[PDB]
């Protein structure tokens, strides 16, 4: 039963803004790295490593990614690799391209996954023999094989960004832990790791995530049953859900081959360089890999490659690493090193390109000197214009003369935050930033930050919950059944008994009206105050507190929280009569509160008090009247 | 079809006469749900195996998907013993759903054949996504609860909490309780522990329940449980004449690997009936059907049209299906579209009596603020339920039909929540939300479906 032919799933769409403001009017997979979009690098690696049915995935700018690939070599009858594109409005991540693969049923068995701009010359055969005879010796345990480089941690190739740590059981290269380490000092590895193996759980930051997977359908299956999930957020619930799912993730590490993928500016530069000096050969940019007539060169001494139609001015020198594309027009006396200029470029005299990369139709004025800086398509350079390391000019972009823009500076025809904002009103080129016959705008740190810069009485507890809920219920218009939800919940959870929890009901009832209260401690303004607060939360006293005893309990509550606020006595009666007209409390047991003086002293005063006279009157004033009504 | 069982006769039905006691539909299927709420490792499925002995599935996928989330079913036959010598609850007992309507006695009960009584469902799930399945829609998910707490630890567990106020917002009033695990228990230990639990339980809905302490793992006390659940538990109000709905749960393609052309079968759907009774070779509907995308990429969705051709209850073999359990609809349906629980989120109904496909949702949702019975250990803000924000991605549980959802707008209370795939619903309907708060999702709110966005179900 030989497997079908071998299909790749190619994300066309980075789905982030780890190019903005460059990639609002280009695709990331259609960046010319060495004069070649990324794609075209991907898709000669899967033609190259035996892919046979590929899978295009587009969303952002899915019109140019169609236009370009259908143009491309792996467009054609001829090619072994029969290029599907597949494109949507609705992708909004990985996820959903892997929900919709799993949808459509497009793969039957082990496939790869990569995205539109990783650059390798891996051959997966290996890979893929060892994840099929995984898979055959274990029935649907390992289901996705990542690929991984050897290389030092000091490699220009390994942003803090994208590096990882992986704890992994060497005795069959299987991921225990995957971890990523932006920003940290001291990696964390649960003890889970030690259980089964006790010999091999070698912990490893030697390992370039090459962003290669070899995934069976049930990678698929699982980003549909976990609609919440990119790749790093299925690896991680995969390691953490090992027990519910006896699924595992294994990894191949290649010594010998180039793989890295271009996920900022940094890695860019870093994977161009790699390119020009051979070390993803045989993707080198004289094989002309991509059968283009406008992308063929010849390669000289010093890994100088120089296309047809190239006129270099007298004098001028190229030390080593450039690459200069066909029809540039090079001035006299210019030094060119480490740098790739596209087609169509025009270069002045007495120039100095330093690791700078001009893409096409780039026009650079007399006397320049660029350092570690990419010129977008069309973008020109005046006179005595010097730019300083990481700095972008996106397309059709122009820097007056006589300026030096600082480490970092991006300018693109885009305003810098106006539509971030609006996410009208034309703001005019500030030339103290972009200079005479400038166009463009200064972009500061707001889309800097991914651009190319970087290197115990639990009844005390029970009545602050209590109180803050109510808060919440009384800001949100909450309903009662929702509140005695709320309250209720908090009693199961800490176990709090029924006495306890009408005594923290009443008390934080009664001191609600006095968080928000200094103390011009007015009587009527008090219960002005609570009077709301008792009519719309009724119904929780009235479900809360009925059988038989508990209203004297409430009573107490009472008792206790007016003892200790003694300045509001005057309004006795104001809680009184606001408590019985809720059908709060009844006349036998308001009747029965006084009927004993076994309290402190002051409780007796607390019932025969200015008012309290009065109101111990009425509570026989109303048995009376209780003839007319209830 | 199967023998040693009531006959059931298409032309010998009627559906006003249907009721949830009926012998003749007790007889194959069971008719009521029963869901135990309890936890693992304290017996909540060694209780179930011993009520209802062991289960075979008729068919099973190589592949489960969902697993935490799979609404399991199990069928148990509860008898009485009609002889009244044999004392209670003895003459009560519990067998499986492949058992004859009458077996004479096998205890020294001086004769009786035994009759059966009723056939329960146990609405059983790893976790506790029931919560939220039935929290707000009601539908007829069950109507009766098994609160279970073992012996060895000392009421109440922090595993406790969260099942009471489970049973609290699921506004469940028939609750029984029993007391696992109790086997290895002494008296005084067994006493101070129901004294601790009817404590915890003071002022809730399992005030007036049974304490039944049982021993699942030796088999002890649970005709008692038989016995409860033929008194206590009173008998639900089904609705046999409207139109059948089935909310589709697993799905087979049951054609094994080298089969004759003779010999393919069509797609099974195994799903749990709302309301109406479902007959062998009706037409029937099931949407959103096939989903796929324009060139462009837009949805859209063909309606499946198919026949009955067979009906199951676990091993037992239906004429006419009732709700009350889980039935697997045999179809003309082909098994490219119902293999591996590929069919599942879809409803399956009489033509024309479906509710409207919607893509997106706007709801009016009231958010929960702590987890219910929750214990704050520590990490104070842990079980504090934030706020909804934009892409955040949720989990819709209408009913028993579960569905993601990114949330993509919220002006004060109304969210509107973009599914991930169509779902068939009506405007108005109880749907509740859930989060990954970390390893499993968890209830954080509900809400009221004020408006959405429909999509057309086109037909050739």
Request: aromatic content about 6%.
């Amino acid at each position: 039963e030989p497997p079908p032919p071998l299909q790749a799933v190619l994300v066309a769409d980075s789905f982030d803004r780890r190019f903005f403001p460059i990639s609002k009017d280009q695709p990331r997979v259609l960046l010319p790295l060495a004069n070649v979009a990324l794609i075209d690098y991907t898709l000669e690696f899967l033609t190259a490593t035996g892919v046979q049915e590929t899978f295009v995935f587009c969303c952002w700018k899915a019109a140019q990614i169609k236009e370009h690939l259908l143009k491309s070599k792996w467009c054609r009858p001829t090619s072994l690799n029969v290029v599907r594109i597949i494109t949507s409005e609705l992708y909004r991540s990985l996820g959903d391209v892997l929900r919709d693969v799993d949808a459509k049923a497009l793969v039957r068995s082990d496939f790869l996954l990569v995205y539109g701009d990783v650059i390798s010359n891996i051959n997966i055969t290996r890979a893929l023999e060892e994840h099929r005879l995984r898979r055959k010796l274990e029935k649907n345990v390992s289901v996705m094989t990542m690929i991984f480089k050897e290389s030092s941690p000091s490699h220009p190739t390994r942003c803090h960004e994208d590096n990882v740590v992986v704890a992994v059981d060497s005795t069959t290269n299987r991921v225990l832990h995957f971890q990523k380490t932006q920003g940290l000092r001291r990696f964390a590895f649960p003890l889970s790791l030690f259980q089964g193996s006790s010999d091999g759980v070698e912990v490893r930051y030697d390992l370039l995530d090459c962003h290669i997977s070899i995934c069976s359908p049930q990678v698929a299956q699982l980003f549909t049953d976990n609609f919440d999930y990119t790749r790093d957020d299925f690896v991680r619930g995969l390691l953490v859900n090992e027990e519910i799912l006896g699924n595992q993730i294994h990894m191949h590490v290649t010594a010998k081959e180039y793989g890295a993928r271009v996920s900022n500016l940094h890695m860019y530069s870093a994977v161009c360089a790699d390119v020009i000096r051979r070390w993803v050969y045989p993707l080198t940019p004289e094989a002309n890999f991509t059968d283009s007539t406008t992308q063929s060169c010849t390669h000289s001494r010093h890994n100088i490659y120089r296309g047809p139609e190239v006129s270099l001015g007298h004098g001028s020198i190229l030390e080593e690493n450039v690459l200069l594309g066909s029809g540039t027009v090079i001035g006299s006396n210019c030094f060119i090193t480490n740098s790739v200029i596209g087609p169509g470029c025009h270069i002045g005299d007495n120039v100095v390109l330093d690791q700078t990369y001009l893409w096409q139709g780039v026009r650079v004025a007399a006397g320049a000197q660029i350092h570690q800086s990419l010129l977008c398509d069309n973008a020109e350079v005046k006179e005595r214009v010097t730019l300083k390391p990481r700095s972008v000019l996106t397309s059709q972009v122009v820097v007056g003369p006589n300026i030096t823009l600082p480490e970092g500076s991006v300018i693109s025809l885009h305003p810098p935050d106006a539509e971030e904002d609006e996410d009208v009103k034309m703001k005019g080129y500030n030339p103290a930033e972009v200079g005479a016959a400038g166009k463009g705008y200064l972009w500061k740190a707001a889309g800097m930050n991914m651009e190319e810069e970087e290197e115990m009485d639990d009844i005390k507890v029970f009545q602050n919950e209590v109180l803050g809920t109510l808060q919440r219920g009384k800001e949100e218009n909450i309903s009662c059944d929702n509140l005695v939800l709320e309250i209720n919940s908090l009693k199961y959870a800490y176990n709090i008994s029924l006495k306890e929890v009408m005594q923290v009901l009443s008390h934080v009832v009664l001191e609600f009206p006095l968080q928000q209260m200094d103390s011009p401690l007015d009587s009527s303004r008090y219960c002005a105050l609570l009077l709301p607060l008792l009519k719309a939360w009724s119904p929780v006293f009235r479900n809360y507190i009925k059988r038989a005893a508990d209203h004297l309990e409430a009573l107490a509550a009472i008792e206790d929280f007016f003892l200790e606020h003694e300045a509001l006595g005057i309004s006795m009666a104001k809680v009184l009569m606001a408590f019985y007209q809720l059908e709060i409390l009844a006349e036998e047991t308001i009747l029965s509160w006084f009927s004993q003086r076994d309290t402190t002293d002051k409780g007796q005063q607390l019932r025969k008090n200015q008012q309290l006279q009065r109101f111990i009157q009425w509570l026989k004033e109303a048995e009376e009247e209780s003839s007319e009504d209830d | 079809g199967q023998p040693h069982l009531s006959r059931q006769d298409l032309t010998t039905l009627d559906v006003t006469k249907l009721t949830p006691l009926s012998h003749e539909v007790i007889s194959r299927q069971a008719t009521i749900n029963i869901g135990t709420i309890g936890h693992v490792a304290h017996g909540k499925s060694t209780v179930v195996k011993a009520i209802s002995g062991v289960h075979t599935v008729r068919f099973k996928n190589e592949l489960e998907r969902n697993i935490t989330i799979k609404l399991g079913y199990a069928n148990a036959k509860i008898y009485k013993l009609d002889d009244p010598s044999c004392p209670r609850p003895e003459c009560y007992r519990s067998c499986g759903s492949s058992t004859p309507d009458e077996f004479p006695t096998d205890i020294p009960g001086t004769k009786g054949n035994f009759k059966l009584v009723r056939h329960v469902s146990f609405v059983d799930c790893p976790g506790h996504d029931i919560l939220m399945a039935t929290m707000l829609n009601g539908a007829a998910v069950m109507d009766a609860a098994l609160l279970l707490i073992a012996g060895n630890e000392s009421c109440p567990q922090p595993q406790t909490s969260e099942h009471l106020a489970a049973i609290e917002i699921m506004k469940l009033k028939h609750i029984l309780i029993l007391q696992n695990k109790i086997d290895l228990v002494k008296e005084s230990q067994a006493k101070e522990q129901y004294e601790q639990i009817l404590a915890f339980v003071q002022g809730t809905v399992a005030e007036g329940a049974p304490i039944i302490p049982i021993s699942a793992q030796l088999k002890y006390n649970i005709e008692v449980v038989c016995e409860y659940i033929v008194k206590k538990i009173p008998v639900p109000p089904r609705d046999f004449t409207s139109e059948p709905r089935l909310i589709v749960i697993r799905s087979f393609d049951v054609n094994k690997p080298g089969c004759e052309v003779d010999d393919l079968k069509g797609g099974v759907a195994g799903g749990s009936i709302l309301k109406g009774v479902l007959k062998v070779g009706q037409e029937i509907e099931v949407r959103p059907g096939i989903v796929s995308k324009d060139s462009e990429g837009k949805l859209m969705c063909k309606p499946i049209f198919s026949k009955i051709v067979s009906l199951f209850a676990e091993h037992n073999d239906l004429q006419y299906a009732a709700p009350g359990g889980l039935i697997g609809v045999g179809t003309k349906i082909d098994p490219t579209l119902c293999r591996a629980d590929r069919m599942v989120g879809q409803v399956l109904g009489a033509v024309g009596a479906l509710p409207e496909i919607f893509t997106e949702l706007e709801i009016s949702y009231f958010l929960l603020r702590r987890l219910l019975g929750v214990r704050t250990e520590g990490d104070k803000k842990a079980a504090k339920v934030q706020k909804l924000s934009k892409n955040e991605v949720l989990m819709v549980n209408i009913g028993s039909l579960s569905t993601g959802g990114r949330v993509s707008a919220v002006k004060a209370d109304l969210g509107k929540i973009v599914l991930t795939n169509p779902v068939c619903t009506e405007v108005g309907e109880k749907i509740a939300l859930s989060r990954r708060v970390e390893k499993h999702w968890r209830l954080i709110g509900w809400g009221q479906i004020r408006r959405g966005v429909t999509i057309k179900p086109t037909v050739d």
